[PDB]
Every structure is written in structure tokens, then in C-alpha cells.
């Protein structure tokens, strides 16, 4: 839904998207055999599959594929500075496959643009989209355009005729942050079988131990999880599944 879904916006108006708790697993994805780039700054996905962030955010936009490199912490250029700047601490990964496939618009793909002529240098995570006629010189711009003055947005005209370097790649900016409250998505959670009547180790929703698991005739309230005894020892588990 927030990944492989339709078109987007121009990177100069690069969009944002918030992600919830829903467990997740990068590694379910990571090996999706589509990520032309998974340049992954924070940690390897095969490692952060269980990494829990109070916040995870997705950005996505249509740009000339090349800009991928500019989407490395420590980059410059009219786009890496005038259309978006990642931070040099982007705990995240640069997901992207390609736009030219679904973005060619053989007669010149428009729909996406870029404030080529922006004033400020992009602060990391700046979502700013304020268009303006900056002073290419000192002719007081205030609208003036035609000499020493122009507006910021220019044409990201992608064609199939022009080469992949001048063809667009679909580009995603991943970014996640874990504060201090109860965090959201918490990687994976494996599942063995209910091996019973024999001495085994067990991990029942974090309750670890060793013993022999049999069937009980006990029953307790639908909200309790495990039962203890007089001496404060676990002797009953409600199979989390």
C-alpha cells in the first residue's frame, strides 16, 4: 500500500507517510527481487527485521534514476540540495526499482518536476515546497522573471528516447525513529509446534523454561496467560496460540 502503489509526487514536493506497530519484517521483503537499490544505511534488513521504531516513515517520488546517489547522506547538487536532502544520520535504506518502465510517457513524462531554482539548502527531512522567483542576479525579482530572475520548478521530462541516465527510477526514502514510549512494529515472532509429553525447552510468549508439557483440566479467565502456585513458580501456560 505505501510501497508498490500507483504514482506519487514530484520530489520537490516529496511526500511523507507514517507507519504503525503491526510487527513487520524487512527480510520478508528485502529478498523481494525488485529492489534495484536497497542501499541500507541504518543496518542490514536481514538484521533490522526485528528492529522496533516508535516511528517509521516512507517517502516516495518520481525522479531521474541517477538521483539515487544524491540520496546518500553526504550529497550535493541542485536536487540533493534543492529538491531533498537526506541527513547524514539517515537510519534507513534507499529502496527503488525504476520509473521509466511505468513512467516513460513516451511523449515526454511530465507530472513530476523539481524546484531547480530553489533558494535555501535543504535541511535534512525538510518537506518544504515553497515555490519562488529567486534572484539569478539582483534585478529585484518579486515576481520579475526573464533576466537575473526565474522561478524554481523545471521540467523532469522523461522520455524513452533519452537514455536510462535521463530516464526516471521510482524512488523510496525509508526512515525510522524509536523514541522512549512503547515502540511499534517489532520484527518477527517464530512458531514451533506443541511437542508434548516429552522434556523440551519452551518459549511461550517470552515465558522461557524447560519441562514436560501435558494437558490439564484446569481453566481460568479468558484474560489470564499463565498460572503460578503457592511458591511462585509457573505450572500452567495458556498456549498463546
Amino acid at each position: 500500500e505505501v510501497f508498490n502503489a500507483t504514482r506519487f509526487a514530484s520530489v520537490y514536493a516529496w511526500n511523507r507517510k507514517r507507519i504503525s506497530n503491526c510487527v513487520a519484517d524487512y527480510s520478508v521483503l528485502y529478498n523481494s527481487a525488485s529492489f534495484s537499490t536497497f542501499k541500507c544505511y541504518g543496518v542490514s534488513p536481514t538484521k533490522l527485521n526485528d528492529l522496533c521504531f516508535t516511528n517509521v516513515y516512507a517517502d516516495s517520488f518520481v525522479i531521474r534514476g541517477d538521483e539515487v546517489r544524491q540520496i546518500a547522506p553526504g550529497q550535493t547538487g541542485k536536487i540533493a540540495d534543492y529538491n531533498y536532502k537526506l541527513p547524514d544520520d539517515f537510519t534507513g535504506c534507499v529502496i527503488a526499482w525504476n520509473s521509466n518502465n511505468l513512467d516513460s510517457k513516451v511523449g515526454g513524462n511530465y507530472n513530476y518536476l523539481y524546484r531547480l531554482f530553489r533558494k535555501s539548502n535543504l535541511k535534512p527531512f525538510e518537506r518544504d515546497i515553497s515555490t519562488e522567483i529567486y534572484q539569478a542576479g539582483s534585478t529585484p525579482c518579486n515576481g520579475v522573471e526573464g533576466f537575473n530572475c526565474y522561478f524554481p520548478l523545471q521540467s523532469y521530462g522523461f522520455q524513452p528516447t533519452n537514455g536510462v541516465g535521463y530516464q526516471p527510477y521510482r524512488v523510496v526514502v525509508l526512515s525510522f525513529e524509536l523514541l522512549h514510549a512503547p515502540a511499534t512494529v517489532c520484527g518477527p515472532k517464530k512458531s514451533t509446534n506443541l511437542v508434548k509429553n516429552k522434556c523440551v525447552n519452551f518459549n511461550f510468549n517470552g515465558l522461557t523454561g524447560t519441562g514436560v508439557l501435558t494437558e490439564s483440566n484446569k481453566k481460568f479467565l479468558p484474560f489470564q496467560q499463565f498460572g503460578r502456585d503457592i511458591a511462585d513458580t509457573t505450572d500452567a501456560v495458556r498456549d498463546p496460540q
Partner: antibody
Framework: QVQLQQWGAGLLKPSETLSLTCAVY????????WYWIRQPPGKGLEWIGE???????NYNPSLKSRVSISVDTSKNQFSLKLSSVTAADTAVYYC???????????????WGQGTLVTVSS | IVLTQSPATLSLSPGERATLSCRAS??????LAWYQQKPGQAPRLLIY???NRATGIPARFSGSGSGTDFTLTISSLEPEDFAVYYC????????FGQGTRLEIKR
């Protein structure tokens, strides 16, 4: 490499029109505000022409003259056709690759000589 | 407005702190370029926009100069530094150079 074939000028009686096919050589030139300049023989070069990739096909405000600039986006080179020459045009014409402050008028062609004289040497 | 340079014909020897003045009256230090023409060659992009020296052209041309009297300071005159300099006012309809500031190697 990045070059501008100043071409199309020639010997001229200072009353008719002329041309400058300052052909963009080695240029993916559909992104720049290509300007032009004019050097009186034995002097410095004063900016005259200024096409704009965004649009704005215009000139020196002091020389807002009949001489007309355009970029043949097909061939992707700036035109600056020297229409209806007068005496005050007597100089040499060039063209250049400019951006204002991102960059400035950077890439220059060799030279385009307007022989604005009837006489031949 | 017209700028003008100091040593119009600066007959300096190589290895000298060659430095060209550029006094204005409209004070467009928000630009003020500086190019060296070789005769028989259209001069290109030496210096421009405040002082940002486009490279390949050595750092010896220590750019400086603000207000109205600007001043590029060549560190050392050198055997390749025999040419004509052009401090370029811009930012208005006056995108003009110097009055052909010549520096003569000696």
C-alpha cells in the same frame, strides 16, 4: 568538446540581415539559459543575447533590437539571427552557456565574425 | 554604470602579487565576475558570483572585493598569466566586464 560553432555570419553591407548558427557542439543543451556576446574588434565583449531554457527569448535591454534569438530545440542550439543590420552592430558575435548563479555564462564557442563592411580584404 | 580596472596595462614580472581593482557605483558584490581573455580565444569562466572561482583556473587568482571597489588578487604572475582581465558586473542589465584590464608579463 562543449563547443558552439559560431557559424552563419559573413561579409555584409551594414543594412541587411545576417545569421548566427552558433551550433551547440557536444551539448545536451536543453537545460540552460544560453546567452550571447558582442566584441568590437580590439575591445571587450558585452553581453547581448540571452535565450532561456524556461523560455524568455530576449536580449540586452540596451540592445532590444530587431536581431532575433531562438533555440532550435530540435537541433538544440541558439539562433540569434542578425536581422536588418545597422552600423551600431559592427563587432564580432559569440554565444555561451549560462545559469546566472548556479553557474554563469560558461561555455563559449570559438568566434563568430560579422564582417559588417562592403569591402573585402 | 561602468567599472574600470587599476593597472590598465600592468607590465608586471612573473611571480608578483598581481591584483586588479574594480570600482563600481551600484555595488553588485552579489556577483562581480572576473575573466581573462587570451586573444584569439573567447574568454570563459574564471571567477563569478561573489568570488566562487570556477576551477581548472588556479587558486592563485585569490578572489576578493566587495562594496563598490572590488579587487581580485592574483597570487603570482606567471608565464601563462599574460592576458586581459575582465571584472564582470552583473545582476542587472549591466552584465558587463572591465574595460579590458591588460596585464603584461615581464
Amino acid at each position: 568538446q562543449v563547443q558552439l560553432q559560431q557559424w552563419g555570419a559573413g561579409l555584409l553591407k551594414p543594412s541587411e540581415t545576417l545569421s548566427l548558427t552558433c551550433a551547440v557542439y557536444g551539448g545536451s543543451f536543453s537545460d540552460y539559459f544560453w546567452y550571447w556576446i558582442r566584441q568590437p574588434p580590439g575591445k571587450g565583449l558585452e553581453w547581448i543575447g540571452e535565450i532561456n531554457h524556461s523560455g524568455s527569448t530576449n536580449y540586452n535591454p540596451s540592445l532590444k533590437s530587431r536581431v532575433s534569438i531562438s533555440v532550435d530545440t530540435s537541433k538544440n542550439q541558439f539562433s540569434l539571427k542578425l536581422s536588418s543590420v545597422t552600423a551600431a552592430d559592427t563587432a564580432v558575435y559569440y554565444c555561451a552557456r549560462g545559469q546566472g548563479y548556479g553557474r554563469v555564462l560558461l561555455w563559449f564557442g570559438e568566434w563568430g565574425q560579422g564582417t559588417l563592411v562592403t569591402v573585402s580584404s | 554604470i561602468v567599472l574600470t580596472q587599476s593597472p590598465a596595462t600592468l607590465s608586471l614580472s612573473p611571480g608578483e602579487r598581481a591584483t586588479l581593482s574594480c570600482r563600481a557605483s551600484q555595488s553588485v558584490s552579489s556577483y562581480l565576475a572576473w575573466y581573462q581573455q587570451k586573444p584569439g580565444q573567447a574568454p570563459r569562466l574564471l571567477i563569478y558570483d561573489a568570488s566562487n572561482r570556477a576551477t581548472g583556473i588556479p587558486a592563485r587568482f585569490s578572489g576578493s572585493g566587495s562594496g563598490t571597489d572590488f579587487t581580485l588578487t592574483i597570487s603570482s604572475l606567471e608565464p601563462e598569466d599574460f592576458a586581459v582581465y575582465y571584472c564582470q558586473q552583473r545582476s542587472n542589465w549591466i552584465t558587463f566586464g572591465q574595460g579590458t584590464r591588460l596585464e603584461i608579463k615581464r
